[PDB]
Amino acid sequence: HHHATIKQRTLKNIIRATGVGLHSGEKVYLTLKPAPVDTGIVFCRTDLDPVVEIPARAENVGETTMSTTLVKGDVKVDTVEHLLSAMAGLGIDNAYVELSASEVPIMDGSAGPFVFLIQSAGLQEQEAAKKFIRIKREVSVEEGDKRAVFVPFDGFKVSFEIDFDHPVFRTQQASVDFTSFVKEVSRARTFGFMRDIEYLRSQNLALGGSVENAIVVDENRVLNEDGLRYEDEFVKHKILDAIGDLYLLGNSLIGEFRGFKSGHALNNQLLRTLIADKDAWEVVTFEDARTAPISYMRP
Ligand SMILES: CC(C)([C@H](NC(=O)c1ccc(C#CC#CCCO)cc1)C(=O)NO)S(C)(=O)=O
Ligand SMILES: [Mg+2]
């Protein structure tokens, strides 16, 4: 009976998965491996000689059209946000993500398969304190009517509001206080509208997309035969995307995020503004899990 530091976590065992890239349609082999303390999440292109390694950090984000992409020179890793959301939701600090192709596999469009594979392998607590980024001041970015904000909050909470001119919503808004990740949002799938598909595919985007890995919406209806997993699956997926984009900070957050029609580009603009404003955040640890504002599942 004593105080217990909240510790960094990595994988207990290797995870292997095969899939297809949502936007490239390429077949890709994925391997998640444990990593030492303070490594962070690092993506490794193992189809290249030499292997190119890209830390999953805000400073390495290149394009943010359709998905969050990591770049180093001529080498990219596309669509990292759903896997990163699973890592953040489960509290994984350190891991190598090996990919045989430029895009993370889409799986079923959600973080569900990733959390299942990770939790089946199990997590391993490590002998070093977990570092948190605590929001100390309000930080806001806007572009037009889009908005993304960090607010101080003793915990971790994400709110999101979207406005789509579309019958399938019959405004969607949701707030989640991390209730917890596996239950609340992990299973929420990405979505696409048929009105955009021919244009997107002409741009070598959405080439792997299908009803097997996305909610496909036409003029009026969801086309997936078995429908939605949640009444508010769309905005729940926006929250999933935000959690993964925010994990590009490299540490879990103590604070609140509020998104208003935000997406990957504005999310990354928010992280860059936050990092530059060192008055607005500090790195903290917790030597006694009992007085911390966050708690994590058993490993
Ligand atoms: C929701 C987004 C934030 C983004 N999703 C996409 O990009 C996406 C997803 C699915 C399809 C499809 C299909 C099909 C079909 C049927 C056969 O042609 C196309 C695009 C995302 O989840 N990023 O993390 S989006 C678009 O609002 O930016
Ligand atoms: Mg998404």
Side-chain angles (χ1 to χ4, degrees), residues 60-183 185-197 199-278:
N60 299 317
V61 168
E63 282 307 279
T64 39
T65 37
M66 304 321 275
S67 72
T68 293
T69 299
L70 297 180
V71 183
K72 182 189 254 194
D74 291 342
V75 177
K76 69 172 163 53
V77 175
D78 192 27
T79 320
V80 299
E81 56 269 24
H82 302 167
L83 178 60
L84 281 179
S85 78
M87 297 290 200
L90 296 177
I92 296 165
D93 295 281
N94 309 298
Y96 301 104
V97 179
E98 289 182 0
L99 294 174
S100 68
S102 71
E103 181 165 12
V104 177
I106 191 56
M107 315 303 293
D108 72 351
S110 79
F114 292 142
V115 296
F116 175 66
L117 291 166
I118 294 165
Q119 292 287 67
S120 298
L123 305 182
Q124 172 67 63
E125 283 190 4
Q126 300 169 287
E127 289 297 292
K130 191 184 185 76
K131 295 194 252 173
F132 294 82
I133 301 301
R134 187 176 79 79
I135 300 303
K136 309 204 320 154
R137 307 278 187 268
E138 180 164 331
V139 177
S140 172
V141 289
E142 3 180 86
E143 281 255 343
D145 64 331
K146 294 162 300 141
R147 185 155 184 260
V149 189
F150 285 130
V151 184
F153 176 70
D154 207 18
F156 180 54
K157 181 166 60 172
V158 177
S159 310
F160 212 95
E161 192 190 345
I162 59 182
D163 184 66
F164 283 122
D165 219 352
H166 197 285
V168 81
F169 304 93
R170 94 190 41 182
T171 74
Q172 282 281 357
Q173 189 282 339
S175 285
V176 181
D177 180 344
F178 301 92
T179 166
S180 275
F181 177 86
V182 172
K183 295 299 257 321
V185 316
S186 78
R187 279 173 38 84
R189 297 163 291 172
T190 191
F191 51 95
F193 298 92
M194 287 292 302
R195 84 191 143 251
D196 302 336
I197 290 303
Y199 173 80
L200 283 177
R201 302 193 123 241
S202 80
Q203 308 294 301
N204 291 335
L205 302 166
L207 294 174
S210 84
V211 291
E212 307 288 302
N213 52 43
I215 310 166
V216 187
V217 186
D218 72 5
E219 192 168 77
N220 271 318
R221 304 181 320 95
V222 168
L223 285 167
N224 307 59
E225 269 137 40
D226 301 300
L228 294 184
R229 298 173 169 180
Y230 307 108
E231 183 174 13
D232 53 350
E233 199 169 354
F234 301 94
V235 69
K236 290 303 192 70
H237 182 81
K238 293 297 284 182
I239 288 169
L240 181 164
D241 278 346
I243 289 167
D245 284 350
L246 295 193
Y247 211 51
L248 291 167
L249 287 174
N251 295 106
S252 298
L253 272 161
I254 298 173
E256 171 183 6
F257 171 89
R258 299 177 190 160
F260 182 78
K261 304 165 83 157
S262 186
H264 311 298
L266 197 54
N267 290 345
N268 198 252
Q269 289 295 132
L270 178 69
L271 302 194
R272 280 163 186 246
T273 303
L274 171 71
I275 286 161
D277 187 357
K278 289 188 148 158

